[PDB]
Write a protein that binds this ligand. Structure first.
Ligand SMILES: Nc1ncnc2c1ncn2[C@@H]1O[C@H](COP(=O)(O)OP(=O)(O)OP(=O)(O)O)[C@@H](O)[C@H]1O
Ligand SMILES: Nc1ncnc2c1ncn2[C@@H]1O[C@H](COP(=O)(O)OP(=O)(O)OP(=O)(O)O)[C@@H](O)[C@H]1O
Ligand SMILES: Nc1ncnc2c1ncn2[C@@H]1O[C@H](COP(=O)(O)OP(=O)(O)O)[C@@H](O)[C@H]1O
Ligand SMILES: [K+]
Ligand SMILES: [Mg+2]
Ligand SMILES: [Mg+2]
Ligand SMILES: [Mg+2]
Ligand SMILES: [Mg+2]
Lengths: 734, 486
């Protein structure tokens, strides 16, 4: 039906633009830039202009938070189209701010909020419409009080907008439009989508679970390092679904004697029961319910048991979802993670560069920036930053922007024009990057890598084999069932140092857009020296929760070398950490699409048990890079560096016969550093590109890292493992 | 409820335990179920509060007072058989112990059929395909899977026909399609994935070719004492409770153990070399006891110790590293073997590729006293390997698998497994390429292409050493001409 649509979140941040689809417009006969009168629930309605985009489905309309709240509806609700009958332009339109959103800032609101928002933008306005505008490092809401030319109008440049004063009191059943929402979360698409899925039916459709009886998820546990926005995500979900958000703070619960703690837990659960669909959020769950063995007080044990029995009592269809955030997935009572109490677990995790960019764009939307703030350069060099680190960085830059113009124009309830006249310059961000101190620097990176097959030259057979083991079971799961045969879940790269094993693993992960986890030799040696091989389990857990994933074990022979050679020190090839890796590999399913890649420069000293079937059964030799791979190395290292066009990198890759990838990396690490040095000397004497002479000067110090004997040994190993037997003449008779 | 009892101060907890027992007494035959017993009564040594100790002691005295004929049975569930007060497991308090354990594929199928009886399914939901690939799932995991699939079925038709006390016809018009189950299988996260599997295996004697003497000996040691306990008493002689398989890698020791377990429909417990090495590295050889407990509670059972020489290899060779052939974990295995009864019908099977470096103490009588050599598979066994791996795979009829098993002279079972792992994977690759260029069976050309990369895993010298060991342990002496006079 043309008068029945479903609400979705708007991609853009436009105040009064709704996105639809061309097939929907086909049955509506509407233009690209016309206006319609959308009628919402509770008799309310608004006027908005439509837009065309292909992201939404045929019968889905995208609306932003402010227009969605104007219609008194939420995501997924039913909204008609009802095109507006072309109401003429407005004349006076009186608008006033809301008292709560204007408190603290006073002055003339025309040149700062009203005029820039209404400049060169014909935005429809109704009597009951309230609109939010971002400026002066704030988000302020304005409500229209009256409109002389009919209740509907369209803002014209000559319209004399009036703002007398006396801000209106906040209404009864209208919520703040800038507190929390899905658009306040940065790049948590997978996790936020998971939470939306688990939470949609229990809360948006409560009577369904009083009439069907299927058990919905009752306990969701958000876990991840601190500062990743778990509380923010829970608040956003509760606000968007409209369910009553009850917040339980771990420290606040545990700061109240030995009485009121239990009373407060019980009262929170009863209040959530008495108040319709609700989300109970228990922030810092490990403060309330840690491992009951490590507790050394009776009241703590009673707190944990009371939480357990409250969670068990929330097995009925009371429409109360209990959410909990912890930084300790393994330091909360295991009895909480059982079925019926906290069944679902969501790992928030570190934001990637895209997520960091999204968070930075969210935190800087109200702030007036400059033109030089890239906001993507910082997002690429904020490694190890959780969203809280990024918020701290943004606030630090903004504060230093205020620390440069601090007492020039006095900020004595201060005027709006001076507030709007601020700017943050990119060098402030580059300053804060050196004063950042990321919290999650020492955290396992789980991200789809940016290495593609372009960054790798040659290795055509290796690329083919890798995509046979990874790309086929992922992108063609129809096979491996028709033929009834599981994909191999592991491969062992072997070859000389510096030949692209890491890049091959990253590129195969990126081709399937799979997560990539790298476990380097120092980490295996850390587990071996400290006898903390139990952490191997955790690594595989991270791989399983991040599926599809490539779990890469670089220099898998590190422990074997640390023990000596092939024998080692008296003992055999088995060690505790590689034994744990074997155990964890046997415990995977091949249906998780977790692929293990081990790399070793010394396949001779590797434990043979890891080469057995059901393990890294395929061995791939990664040889010394051929000339095409050398050209790729040179191009990849030289990209991001201004290099002269006359350099014959193809020629450069011809006498680098037995050179490894690290050899050419050092070749530019020297030529390009000579260029830097020449720049500095010429700048000293005076006060653009890596020339051919720089590359000749660097090649004058070119040495092969891997000797001929080592290459001979690698070739011998490859022969004895790949030359097979004399079965090349086999043929079925007739 | 454990948590509910322990959530009530230091008063009402005891009062509630007492009142529960008195209410059960006053109300005829009754079952008191104490769910999560370890919450109420853990190891009193690990308790660090007076009220917890009083709770345990009050439970003990209530259970002792329920020694009269009050017709009250007390049931209790725990996930901790070894983390509840041992004083509860004494005679008169909690005498009987029932291990529920992981459901098998049949049990998982039954649970799925139970959870889907009210649900309106589709025609494509096999409900047995999922039951076979829900390994590591307890019934709660299966219930979560079923609810997840049903919810996604509701997440595909969510706001089309409005579910505003809603009508019955729309409720009856739902369906869950098999791809929903296959979706949830990748989002399953089984709770009991890392749990010891104790199940009757599906391997039969058909999946094994040849090994006629080995099959005969295995059924002499396992099938006879189980299916003919009338003997071994008439002749007054206990069956041997252990055997040691030895032979080259990839020759069917695991399959032989599984098949002998399945013939008697006995439980099968497999303890692989990484687990023995885990106990050895961590010095947690006490867990050997637990393994044997699992074997004893699952009786009749075949307790299989695959690669029993793993610790000996990890130490080096026959001598190892200075020391002798004894190690803590194999010593615990010896201790546990001496403590069995042969009346439980628990059979130990050890497998080793290196019988030379095995501790000789494990070969003594009352232990794995019989040694069986599992040689490189003969042509019939090769044909069985090829047929078993190729089953579940569409393979052309013109392939002469019998011929294929003729030049695979010194090939091991793993060699032929890799032969199809390559031919059948070439078939998959050809399918994908032809599907890319375009947009059925493993042909003979695929098998020839795979055999072009056929290598023997086990060398002639290793086979010679295995044969030498078999001779010095089985050629015996020159007593073949013995005969009683007259
Ligand atoms: N085939 C290749 N394609 C792209 N880059 C390559 C290739 N071979 C080597 N390199 C270059 O080598 C450098 C790093 O080598 P890499 O880490 O892949 O080596 P490796 O084979 O894992 O060996 P090692 O264990 O000795 O570090 C990078 O500069 C990379 O560009
Ligand atoms: N006699 C046999 N009957 C059936 N399958 C066999 C036989 N011999 C080998 N195989 C095949 O070998 C593969 C696995 O071998 P298996 O696990 O039984 O070897 P093993 O003797 O225990 O040696 P290892 O300790 O080296 O793994 C399977 O593909 C199986 O089909
Ligand atoms: N994913 C995110 N997107 C946007 N802002 C974030 C994100 N994560 C953290 N922040 C910022 O960090 C601040 C604190 O995050 P917080 O909710 O305490 O983390 P957690 O919820 O993990 O304890 C929030 O005010 C928010 O502004
Ligand atoms: K917060
Ligand atoms: Mg938190
Ligand atoms: Mg490497
Ligand atoms: Mg229970
Ligand atoms: Mg074996």
């Amino acid at each position: 039906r043309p008068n029945r649509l479903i609400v979705d979140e708007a991609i853009n941040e436009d105040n009064s633009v709704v996105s639809l689809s061309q097939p929907k417009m086909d049955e509506l006969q509407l233009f690209r830039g016309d206006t319609v009168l959308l009628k919402g629930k509770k008799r309310r309605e608004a006027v908005c202009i439509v837009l065309s985009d292909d992201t939404c489905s045929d019968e889905k309309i995208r609306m932003n938070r402010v227009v969605r709240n104007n219609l008194r509806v939420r995501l997924g609700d039913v909204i008609s189209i009802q095109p507006c009958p072309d109401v003429k332009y407005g004349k006076r339109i009186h608008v006033l701010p809301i008292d709560d959103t204007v408190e603290g800032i006073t002055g003339n609101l025309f040149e700062v909020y009203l005029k820039p928002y209404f400049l060169e933008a014909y935005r429809p306005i109704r009597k009951g419409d309230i609109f939010l505008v971002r400026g002066g490092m704030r988000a302020v809401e304005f409500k229209v009080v009256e409109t002389d030319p009919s209740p509907y109008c369209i803002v014209a440049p000559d319209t004399v907008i009036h703002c007398e004063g006396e801000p209106i009191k906040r209404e009864d059943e209208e919520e703040s439009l800038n507190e929390v929402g899905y658009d306040d979360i940065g790049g948590c698409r997978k996790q936020l989508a998971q939470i939306k899925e688990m939470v949609e039916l229990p809360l948006r459709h409560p009577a369904l679970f009083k009439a069907i009886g299927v058990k919905p998820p009752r306990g969701i546990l958000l876990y991840g390092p601190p500062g990743t926005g778990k509380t923010l995500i829970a608040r956003a979900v509760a606000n968007e679904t409209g369910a009553f958000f009850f917040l339980i703070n771990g420290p606040e619960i545990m700061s109240k004697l030995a009485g009121e703690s239990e009373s407060n837990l019980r009262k929170a659960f009863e209040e959530a029961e008495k108040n319709a669909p609700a989300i109970i959020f228990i922030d810092e769950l490990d403060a309330i319910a840690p491992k009951r063995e490590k507790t050394h007080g009776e009241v703590e044990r009673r707190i944990v048991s009371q939480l357990l029995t409250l969670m068990d009592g929330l097995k009925q269809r009371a429409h109360v979802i209990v959410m909990a955030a912890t930084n300790r997935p393994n330091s909360i009572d295991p009895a909480l993670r059982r079925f019926g109490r906290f069944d679902r677990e969501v790992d928030i995790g570190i934001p990637d560069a895209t997520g960091r960019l999204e968070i930075l764009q969210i935190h800087t939307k109200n702030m007036k920036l400059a033109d030089d703030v890239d906001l993507e350069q910082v997002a690429n060099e904020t490694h190890g930053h959780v969203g809280a680190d990024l918020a701290a960085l943004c606030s630090e830059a903004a504060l230093q922007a205020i620390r440069k113009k601090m007492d020039l124009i006095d900020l004595e309830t201060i005027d709006a024009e001076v507030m709007n006249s601020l700017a943050v310059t990119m060098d402030d961000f580059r300053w804060a990057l050196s004063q950042s101190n990321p919290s999650a620097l020492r955290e396992t990176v789980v991200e789809v890598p940016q290495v593609t097959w372009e960054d790798i030259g040659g290795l055509e057979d290796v690329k083919r084999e890798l995509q046979e083991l990874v790309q086929y079971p992922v992108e063609h799961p129809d096979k491996f069932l028709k033929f009834g045969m599981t994909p191999s879940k592991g491969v062992l790269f072997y070859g000389p140092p510096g030949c692209g094993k890491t890049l091959l693993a990253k590129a195969i992960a990126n081709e399937c857009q799979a997560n990539f986890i790298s476990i380097k030799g120092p980490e295996l040696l850390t587990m071996w020296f400290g006898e903390s091989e139990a952490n191997v389990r955790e690594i595989f857990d991270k791989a399983r929760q991040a599926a599809p994933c490539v779990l890469f074990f670089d220099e898998l022979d590190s422990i074997a070398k640390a023990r000596g050679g092939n024998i080692g020190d008296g003992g055999g090839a088995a060690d505790r950490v590689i034994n744990q890796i074997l155990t964890e590999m046997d415990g995977m399913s091949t249906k998780k699409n977790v692929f293990i890649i081990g790399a070793t420069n010394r396949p001779d000293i590797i434990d043979p048990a890891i080469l057995r079937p059901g393990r890294l059964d395929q061995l791939i030799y990664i040889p010394l890079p051929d000339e095409k791979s050398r050209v790729a190395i040179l191009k990849a290292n030289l990209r991001k560096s201004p290099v002269a066009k006359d350099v014959d990198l193809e020629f450069l890759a011809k006498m680098t016969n037995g050179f490894s990838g690290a050899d050419l990396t050092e070749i530019c690490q020297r030529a390009c550093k000579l260029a830097i040095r020449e720049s500095i000397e010429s700048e000293i004497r005076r006060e653009p590109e890596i020339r051919r002479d720089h590359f000749e000067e660097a090649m004058r110090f070119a040495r092969r890292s891997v000797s001929d004997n080592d290459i001979r040994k690698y070739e011998m190993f490859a022969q004895t493992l790949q030359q097979s037997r004399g079965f090349g003449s086999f043929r079925f008779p007739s």
